[model samples]
Target: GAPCGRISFALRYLYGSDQLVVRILQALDLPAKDSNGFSDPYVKIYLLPDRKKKFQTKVHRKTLNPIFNETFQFSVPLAELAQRKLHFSVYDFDRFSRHDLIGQVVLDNLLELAEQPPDRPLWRDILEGGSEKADLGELNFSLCYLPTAGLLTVTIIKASNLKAMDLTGFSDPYVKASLISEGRRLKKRKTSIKKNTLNPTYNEALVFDVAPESVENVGLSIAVVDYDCIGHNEVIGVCRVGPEAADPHGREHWAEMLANPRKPVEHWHQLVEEK
Candidate 1:
């Protein structure tokens, strides 16, 4: 995990809508997680152990200090929010392997922050994490559905700014598509590996038969992994397309396809680091 730093962010309560909005502003003087005193960083926001309600920011390359002026909103009853914890994790982006943990801040009581004067913003030193935190870079892909045939297709396009997993400075990459239902993995599929490239283009499609009625219960998880010849393969990053996902793009594409029936809805998503 990365060392301690002062992190600033903002929080607000929407009374009419019953939502809590968190604005991830920036971090200052962070300790580097890489060989160089620089790290490609990104932010991950979680509402506790609920993995389904996660949000992440895009990667900012080569800097110890990063400014991620991104906002995420969570819908919760005002009475229930105080009982929930907000876990903010910072990670160094790696393409070929798992991301490095820079630090983390777990807020046990958001209500306290919400109670602060609006004129003053919230800031705290990172509590940081142990060796467990990691993040691979991002993945690019598209989704399409054919309702009549009950088929869903996932296209593994290309990845950008992948972390160099191999000591040789490049990684052998491949993508996997998994069908998820009721928190269980139902089926899995994969694409051909593109050898020794930071930016790999597969242009391959993984398809599955999932009915419209079952769409509500099903989700698609796409994982970008580093293939190792002698040792164990590593996971770089992962993203999901499904009903319960907090990703607006994924939700929009899925809704568009079901509403239109057989259209291909294409959208780009920034992959999140998975454990």
Candidate 2:
């Protein structure tokens, strides 16, 4: 019932061949991430600290179990292979409503497996998910959930490197935070627009009267927008917070806030276009 799974791959050091070959085998027990209880999944592979060397496999249409068996090669000294970390994250494709992150698998250090037999397969359970980030920017804020009075406070701290939306090469930016329960938006609030700046700051906070329910049912959607005095405001990007948030950062922040009631838990969410 959760969005998680397992993936298998084989990795072995080619002695002095200067070629590191990786074979993405398949995925198993992946969750249904689509409306029809199916998934079109693929794998993204890269070596950490050197993500420039990247690889992606073809998407296997409408299946929780995807098999690529495709091989990828990377050029690196055997000396450096010991320092590399292998990363493969699974994603569900939907043409492009935004490809959803199904889960992840990571090989912390290659040193542990260099002695394995040729073509020895390694298995990892895909861990969790996070929303994709864009060039628009990020939002920093805190959530303080006090269950007694059921006060859920969202403190809008600041934003940096927001998208330029005005002719002046800058933007009049502000943050809008919305409270939602299940699917319906209960209410929303906005911060004061700081005139003319790509980086905006607003230490102001908004309060929501949430009561008699677990925080699990409540969530928040945050958006950064460029306000125009005489036209429709341009939306920069957005982030989600709370239980239903697909973003791991937001989900963790909500979890931390719930764990320590009455205490503010701050986090940064890389804003992204839903489109």
Candidate 3:
């Protein structure tokens, strides 16, 4: 599901050792695959060009980074290994019918080895290859519509399971909203930034003024952004509520707001990124 992570594996050639073995040093910064902001991860290694000969690591629980320093001896050929590719498909092994694919890292054959400090450790940004979309996180908020006054209230309550944009292993997250009517931007508002967290709460509300008839044409675009002091603030994920949302909430959230006039209809929806 595109739960991206980095693989740091030890690389060494045969000829120098008793036999060439596949050694996984560890994996770091793995994106959480479950809503709980954690994952049960394991790695399946294979000698490819599509080799049925493979090795699987022990599954780790409630983890984002796993460093077991495990080893597996393979069918080695030091110089006959020019035609080799090790496929490490990282997976989130869960307690269900299927496992969530956490992306992969292909180990290419390093030429003429034996130039290391006895051993070699290498990094690979796990290449994401699976579903078209992955879960970024979810947003919690409420909507209130005053029919008589033609006012709509959007409250930014909190965010959970948010992916971090920082190397510090945390996110400084904020919610920003924009009013779009008939496919055009009309107004914008934002919430205060919360520092260093995967879950942040605000309970801040932004009010909007429009005629009751405009409700059919006007929509709210909510964006979860990560505040970066050194660079531009980056968007973590987004949602739309009105006629043209990612589809469902276009009717669901807006309809619920209208169904209960003057009452906040709170909804927690999954956040998505723009194309």
Candidate 4:
């Protein structure tokens, strides 16, 4: 058996939604309880104006551990905690009434980092799913990592001329998206567009929360998949993610595809409908 200990955690707050979901990232990789049936544990969170000051209560919960199977939400009045730190500690129960400390999550630079400008423009991509020959294409794309804002814009530049192609014959072409982090999918969302109705520049906006130190980067994928007779489809488009930490190699954006990749702007945006 191992001895009890505590872990210090942190993350960056980029968007308002990110602020709403910070618990998801901060609680990852936390140690599990000694027994699955052990008495539920409780956690106490402290909020401070700065990392250097005392703290105030933020949240408290009683559970086995890893309270994430269900959705968790928390709200903070930004005005009250300006330039502050969020400190947290989890305690395990003991018959003698000794509160065994399990871990801690510390947040800093919430204001300075939150107000930073995005490295790239604000955008996201759209994906249509189908067999290769059917119409839509494979999975793989980039997202503009707005570090300061904690929001990523994915630009999917697949257009037919200046207008969108007519996907009339194709069955339900689905557009599902996911954000990858530490081998887990977070904040998954998607929307379906009308058959053969995609414009040159279609964007999807998904917002979530994360801590600066917790977020490594943003990952995205779009596919046109729907429930029905879906044979195949052509997937054509240029993708751009973020303003890399320092000019990320092997990373391409719509501008790079247009300006450098030289992908055909007029015909690249193809459309299909199997009616």
Candidate 5:
């Protein structure tokens, strides 16, 4: 009955798949709502991959509440969750059978390999001063999550289609890109894109040093910043590299990110290596 701040637990799975399988680990707290009487509630777990759409499968048929107060492991068909992310929903069967989305977690090789870095007090204090505008016409660029090296990379394939205002007067316009993760700028670099050239492109790689000491989530974000737009500056097409390993707890970034008890495990990719 709302006995503590948080609960500690773990889920272990042993299975084979051509793609990554997403398993939802949940804690239904509806019991805490009942001060007396038998609530006698149960849980139903469903997998909705699109996150915006309907559930693809009822992964777990209604199971008695708390499931013996122990670890209840459920598996989702890898084929079902083979996308950018997985949205898990938990249901309270007895209490009007409503769906309670406690949280949403992603499943991917990069995320599986890297552990989350320790929380930092300075993260919230970073001086990020600026306002962003919604560019309705900005061109969209996509980056795939890299499973190897735990890195996320992006290749710009076109610039003419970009929604930035006219740039007929700038020489080698610089495309300064940055990654904003967990309310902090992890890394930034600049590249040049020519004007009105059909199919002019090159790839820029911004590797996020593991978290606390680096950034949270391996989700790679790319942005194109040009100074010649109608305003003093302009930005567009932000994309992420390694979605899975975005949070660097890797051993190397431990000390830099102020990770306590820092060590090699935090920077290593053993988590994603096939065990």
Candidate 6:
């Protein structure tokens, strides 16, 4: 049985190139999590187990029926996509607290759709606890080390292609930076919240005290978070810098910082799904 609502979406396959495109049309009869009869609802879609490529619909305010009409694309080999699962998570936005979960639906085999007509829209019933994942975009920042003062500085400059978390197509965003040493979390700092923008400019710096010799043992983690005045904040995206980072850009940037002491070394990192 459909939980509380119905979702209508369409899928199209692009041959030669591995592109699976999804078109989210609308949602109907969504349950309200708030005191009001209506809900601020949005949809997040993912290719499960591997959430590297994800997409979301805009929030539809104060309505049981919402029209999304949004399109998303994914690059996956056709054969591999059939083995993968499609996850859909519905959410009710609450400005003061955590976004309430409305319901979720998972497609065990997307390949089943291959038998259906490409032009036809597929309807699915929302269920509970099938796909519980969030999709946020990337963040960009830089790092610099001052060996003379034993200070390590992290600059939160700006973010691009961020996920829209609010009904107005924008998010109240902030940046949080954490210093890690010896696998333990050390000092953390955050920037001021920038209101109503997907592209937010912080240009703020967070500083930590560390010895130059110990730089090899330290790591830096930076997260772009959605700020909600009433409830728990949501992490929009995360990036890591230092020797332990999986990306060579981080290690290279760290090496550059050490090579040229007291100079700022900047690099742009694509934010990945939060673990």
TM-score of 2: 0.52
Order of candidate numbers by TM-score, starting with the best:
3, 6, 2, 1, 4, 5
- Taking the tens digit of each residue's C-alpha lDDT, what string does model 3 give over 1-275? 23487878775655655466657888888988877989888999887864787888898888898986888876466665678777888887755223667788766654444345335787778887554466789898887878777767887788799976665668889988775555445477889889989999998888877678777664777889888877668788887775564568545767777766744556577776552
TM-score of 4: 0.28
Candidate 2's C-alpha runs over 4 A off are 1-3, 129-275
Off by over 4 Å in 6: 1-135, 181-186, 243-245, 262-264
Task: Give a tens-digit lDDT track for model 6, residues 46-78.
Answer: 989687666778888899888888889888787
After superposing candidate 5 on the true structure, give the runs of residues whose Cα lies further than 4 Å from its correct spot. 1-150, 167-176, 196-200, 207-218, 229-231, 236-275
Q: Which lDDT values do the candidates have, in the order given? A: 0.75, 0.76, 0.74, 0.37, 0.33, 0.76
* Candidates 2 and 5, the one with greater lDDT: 2
Tens-place lDDT digits, model 5, residues 58-89: 22333322332322333545344344343333
- The candidate 3 region of ten consecutive residues with least summed lDDT is 110-119
Q: Could you give candidate 4's per-residue lDDT for residues 1-275 as a string of tens digits?
A: 12222322323344565442233212323344435534334445545543333322223344433433222333555564464565555555543222445545455545543443432121111112222234433323333434465554433333322121223423333345554334335465555444543332344444444444443343433344442333333233222122322323322342342232222222222222221
What C-alpha lDDT does candidate 5 achieve relative to the native structure? Answer: 0.33
Query: Candidate 1: which pairs clash?
Result: 2-101, 2-102, 94-163, 95-162, 95-163, 96-163, 99-134, 99-135
**Where does candidate 2 clash, by residue pair?**
none
Misplaced by over 4 Å in model 3 are 1-16, 21-132, 181-184
What is the C-alpha lDDT profile of model 2 across 1-275, one tens digit per residue? 13587788887666767777778887788988887889999888899878776798998888888888999988778788666788887888764244667887778877767766656777777886545445888888888867677888888888888877654678889878775546545477889989988778898888877764656664777889878766668678888775554677777777777666644567577876552
RMSD per candidate (Å) reads 16.0, 10.6, 11.9, 24.4, 21.2, 10.9
| Model 6 Cα shift for residue 82 (angstroms) | 21
